[PDB]
Amino acid sequence: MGRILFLTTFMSKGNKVVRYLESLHHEVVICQEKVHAQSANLQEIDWIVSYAYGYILDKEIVSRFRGRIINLHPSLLPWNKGRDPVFWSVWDETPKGVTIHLIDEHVDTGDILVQEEIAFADEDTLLDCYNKANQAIEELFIREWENIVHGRIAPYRQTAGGTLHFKADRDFYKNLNMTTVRELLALKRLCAEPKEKPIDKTFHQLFEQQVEMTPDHVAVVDRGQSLTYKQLNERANQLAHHLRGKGVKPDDQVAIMLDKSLDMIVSILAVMKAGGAYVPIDPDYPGERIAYMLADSSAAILLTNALHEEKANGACDIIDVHDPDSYSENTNNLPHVNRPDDLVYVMYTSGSLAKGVMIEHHNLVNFCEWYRPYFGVTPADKALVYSSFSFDGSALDIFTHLLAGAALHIVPSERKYDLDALNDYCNQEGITISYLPTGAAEQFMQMDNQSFRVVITGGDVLKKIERNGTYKLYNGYGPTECTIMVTMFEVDKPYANIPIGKPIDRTRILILDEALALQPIGVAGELFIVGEGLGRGYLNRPELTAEKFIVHPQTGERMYRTGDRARFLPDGNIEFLGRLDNLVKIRGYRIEPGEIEPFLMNHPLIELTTVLAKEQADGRKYLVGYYVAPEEIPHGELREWLGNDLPDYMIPTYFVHMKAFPLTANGKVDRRALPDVQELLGEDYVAPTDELEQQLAQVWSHVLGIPQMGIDDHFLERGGDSIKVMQLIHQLKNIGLSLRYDQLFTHPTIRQLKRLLTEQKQVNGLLEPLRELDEQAEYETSAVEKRMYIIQQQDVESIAYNVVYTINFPLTVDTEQIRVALEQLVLRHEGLRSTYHMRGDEIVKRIVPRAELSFVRQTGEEESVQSLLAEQIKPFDLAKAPLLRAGVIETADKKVLWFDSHHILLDGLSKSILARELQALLGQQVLSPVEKTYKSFARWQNEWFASDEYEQQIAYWKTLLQGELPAVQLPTKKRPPQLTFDGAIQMYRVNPEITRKLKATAAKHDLTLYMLMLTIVSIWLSKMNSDSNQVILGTVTDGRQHPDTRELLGMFVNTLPLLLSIDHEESFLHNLQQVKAKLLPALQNQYVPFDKILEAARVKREGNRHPLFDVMFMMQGAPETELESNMHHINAGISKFDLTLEVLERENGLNIVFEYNTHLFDEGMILRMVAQFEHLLLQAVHGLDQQVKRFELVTEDEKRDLFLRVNDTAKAYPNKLIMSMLEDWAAATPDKTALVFREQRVTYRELNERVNQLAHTLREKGVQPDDLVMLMAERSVEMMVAIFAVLKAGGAYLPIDPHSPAERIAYIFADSGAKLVLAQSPFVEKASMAEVVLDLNSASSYAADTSNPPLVNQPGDLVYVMYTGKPKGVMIEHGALLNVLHGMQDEYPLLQDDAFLLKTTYIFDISVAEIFGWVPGRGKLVILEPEAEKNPKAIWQAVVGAGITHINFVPSMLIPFVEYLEGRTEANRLRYILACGEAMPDELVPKVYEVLPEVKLENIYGPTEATIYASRYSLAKGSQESPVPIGKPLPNYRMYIINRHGQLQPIGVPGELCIAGASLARGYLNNPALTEEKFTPHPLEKGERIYRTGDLARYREDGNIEYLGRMDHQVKIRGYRIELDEIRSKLIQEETIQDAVVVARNDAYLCAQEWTVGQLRELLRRELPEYMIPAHFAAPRTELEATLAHIWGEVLGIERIGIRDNFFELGGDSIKGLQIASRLQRINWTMVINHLFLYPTIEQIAPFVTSEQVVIEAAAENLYFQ
């Protein structure tokens, strides 16, 4: 032992490490603050252990305790030294690990003691990586601390190079903690600084270079006149000489007021050559505007003519461009005075006076030097100067193409607006490339153009892509402040939101938040531009330039504040989402009107769309949808068209039809000339006509929050939920009318609702208030409160039903104001002051006046917040208040408020109420005191349980949940024997777009979003349950039966079992309506407690699963407060059920949370399932009229992973047929041993020559290719001589067992119709009814010619016909046999020194692998004596004597061969024992490797219709494979597992195995019907055939297939499939291995050296589920067991309970355990309820618990009053 000073600052004081040190009987002194060398915290201490310790230790301390200071750093030092190490281990892509090192004078550079390499998953979030890393360094310390303190570990120095980081180095990569590793590394590439050459040129320099390259090329074309490059250059130099002499210096602002002409191009280049920048002034601008631009530009010279000279009013030195005295005689290039950082132009932006944007030379050059190579601009191109020279569009028109040698065509403003004339000019002049603004483009795309090859657009949101031309379409984005454009996208596909593209050269785009921090990919934010497009700024306006042109506080880079919202897509392109301020609020919903335009244009008749937001003086804002179409479209039609996938507040109130959209002169839609409309409520508004219709409309207005409802307005499509329907019903009770929850979906408008209720009379008393209970000592609990109490008492140390939520606050929030407000809520709500105790056998509640809240204040870092939180999640004692612990973890950037409650208090609605009231109290707002208490509701409901309605509702579940309920066997792992509540979480986010389509679809078809998701979940579960027609799942309801309990803090949620049906042969919409028809009756009987529902159903209690259902589907509405939207639910590693799906509406989308049992599902299994749910969800929302059968579960990524891991087996194999190999080999090695029968040896030559003779004798009998001759012979050399001779002649051999009954051979005589029969002498008389019968033992049936007969067979000719219920003839071709032989030879090679054993009967295909397995490789075939296959002695004698290396065994016959060999030590040459014919016992693998080491046991599978084999799995000496897979396909084999509808099944889901490839059979002989049934073409093979095996099989994660039995011989007990092999193995593992086999009989029931009677059930109970226990195969001892029998019997209701009786079998539940424990406490016995689940028998549990509470009698006995 020794004293240890534990130094931690951002970790806790009670960590696993400290407690482990205390467990070793150490004294751990913990200091969370600074320590000075003279601090008493440094005396008598032997070690110093640091762990997330802020502050650096003093120098004297490091030297004084040298070798005794130990730090726990969560990194693989030397990598990521310092702060935030785990995050930097990912972002900098460094090695991952953890290090226990020594402390030196520097930051984590000391010598290492131990180090471990941890691995992060790409799909793990950063927070997941933090927990994994911090746990690894803690467990490593627990593992090595003793080896350190005892000096058993030698410190080693660090490998040289690594990384160091500090505290503020992550303040930009925040907001990224929930982002996965792959998505983080992607955002890195998409937003990290790339490595390029700078710009050392100006435009005139580059233009003067191109002028020398294409001097005589036409440069500008105005009217019919033209100008070449040299002529343009010389005319500009003349004017620039005159300008520079007048007094133009760099950074001057010479203005130009000319119309589009040649003189404009000359003028522009003259200013730049002189040295200045040109300020374009439109000659048509107002006079005051012209003067402002001149005054602001500070221009002394004006380049105008005589038409626009008087528009200056003596404002500058006018230089007429038509006066010859304005041009010099110098046509030589001027001397250069400019720099790449000089102004080139100043264009003004009238964003409403204008602002002069200043652009420099290097900005334009970077754009021009990118434009030319991007679009391939050649000197052969033609572009038009379309845009006015007062906009940056003309810069792209003029400057980008002049640097490429192209020709500019000046567009007269007389045209330009006539897009028909522009298409003419473009066609008759061959214009190839140009830039058209968005509005003009979308109108030009309706023109027949053949000249353009590239058309670029940009300015407004581009939507239309359908064009009448062969030109490529490009979309661009960019503000004038950043040159012209910064991103470019090629419009290839149709897009809803056409991307603005990827950044251009020397330009980087960043999507940031309001704090200028990096947003994750997909999350929107402000577009920030960085690169060589950023100009100097605004002219004479430095304040605004500092506002938009900012330097980054963390990157030091100059950025432009675009003010636009955008998001990065995964591909790399940027998607424009709108302006950050142009968001309008319609019906209280902030929307972007531009999101509606793509849906309206998708209408078949609308070709142009623009949605505008207009306002009325009253305040209300309305959307107007302007559309261009051939004629008008009905208003309702447009409301229907948008209603298919848009909510109501985004459906415009008014629609305006237009012939053509007005365009501004800039090329954009006018958006101000668009006609106006008019306070009307629309055309679909029908006002109430009766008193009841107005009464209902006001109730509808109150619930849905919409004023002036319509008679034909749909409740669900205007915001109605389930709670809104129940509100409507309750508000109608106050009126006096009764509406059922189902009648709303059948009457979803006020019109129909009136017709239903107008015949009803107002009844009083329909809504009774809740009576407030008078003051009492104790209060009775509710049924759900009792149930939560019963659950917690099973394991009184469980956190499964603990409710943890965290909220991240800014550091400005007073931590005490939170505590104060939380302490107010403890007073306001009696639930926070309620304590639950037990009075006898009754659970009661007691309210306490005041309770003390636990508010722990801590300090932590980002990589410790979770582990600081995880230790605060401790069990609750339901007898102690406040039942809610809280606290605040303060980091350097946030304050994490946390609280932990119990589900007996905090349900879903209680969390929303608590967040609402905390946000009010934190806002210093008043809180009107509460009015009702949970004690009142409990009494109300406990009384309602004795009503008549309750008896009606309990009959619904008794008449429904009784019978053989559905069985959902999800593809899980092996179910643990007990119950596991260990779990994890995976999340799937549905984007806001699909979320709208899901909601709009549900509303359109009288459904809620919950009903729609429930069907998708039901279909998802059904398809995983082998396409079941019925499923069972669970859900949760609010449980607020009395309407006065919606503001109370308590547990109300009730659990409902949902029995649903899915018809795969019908549409999604059909199943959607039938799901509603099964949910609504359940919601009408929803208030029966779940424990009573189970009892009424008379359900089992199988310990491997949960009652009634195993999967739960929950849905919570959107957050009502902002404090609620910023809350985070914590799982803490608990899964209450096998799988839970919760759909949470967050941020206009859907966050679907997958809570799963970690013992039943892996991370990869869940990742496949969340991807399959998305696959079905997208398939369904886009396939409503489609049948559910046509939806596929497997994803394209799973289809391609299954191919690569399984069906990628193609390998080119030689086409030399097996006969030609015997010829080729015999000629090479003629006297080498080929056959060995008994003690005689045949050589290749002897075999070949003997085979040749019988071949010639066969040819003269009419043996032609694809002719069949039957064989009746036993194991001999003649059989081998026969078989090979059949093939040499050209035919195929048909094996016929010679000892077959005459009826069988007659059948195969008829079906084959074959005439020839090669038989042995004892069987010639059996072939009596043939034609040509030859005795193989008579030299008459042989000939003299030892010559090899000619080759007459082709790779597609039949080689044998194996017969298999009347047998059928499987026809096998040559190349089929050649492929399985080459594959087996490539896998299990038989070489020259190796051999085979002929032991399988030739009426079995496995024999063929022995008949021919030796020919490739030139081995030998030892022919086992006939009937010796049953004698393992004779078998063994052969392998030892002949050196047999390849042997085939049926698993049943390998058992007697593994025996006998037990003990024998004779040497062996065996190499492969290939097993096939039946399922391999899991116990045989070790038995084989024990008796015969060095052998390689291999399990092979293959039907006769796939030659011989098809799949193989190599068993290893590890002996750990319980499934015993049949394996993966062989070379050029492909296997598929399909469902009942022909779809590929995913991993784990069972289906029918199917085969495909080269070694497939040609078909059944004389049975084309069966050939068409079992050999079918399939889209998986692209029209090629597949063989239906008829065997059930499942895919494994490895890829190896598992044999599940024949589909027509499948055993199912109560729906669940039975694996009878797993039953026998669990029965054989005992000592008495009688090896009894289990089989199923029908009465359907399972039946199967010890007097085991019913005790074997107890053995098969702790390993197998009750549905896989074979049905057919009182002695209380002490006073304790005698007592236990009485309490059990009295509670369970059973008489004479004996020990060794299963408590749960006797009807036990977690409720009856609490009763049994309660009765036992009053007699001072102590039983733990969890022990009942571990020791379900009395003799088992009586010692393992049932301790006594010691009673004493003393203290003060005698008193003496002095």
Ligand SMILES: *P(=O)(O)OCC(C)(C)[C@@H](O)C(=O)NCCC(=O)NCCNC(=O)CNC(=O)[C@@H](NC=O)C(C)C
């Ligand atoms: P015993 O186990 O032998 O007897 C059987 C019974 C019926 C007693 C027992 O098995 C039982 O009660 N089963 C049902 C338990 C159940 O349904 N628990 C679910 C409770 N609801 C939730 O966990 C989720 N509800 C919420 O409101 C959460 N919202 C989101 O998570 C809150 C935590 C906010």
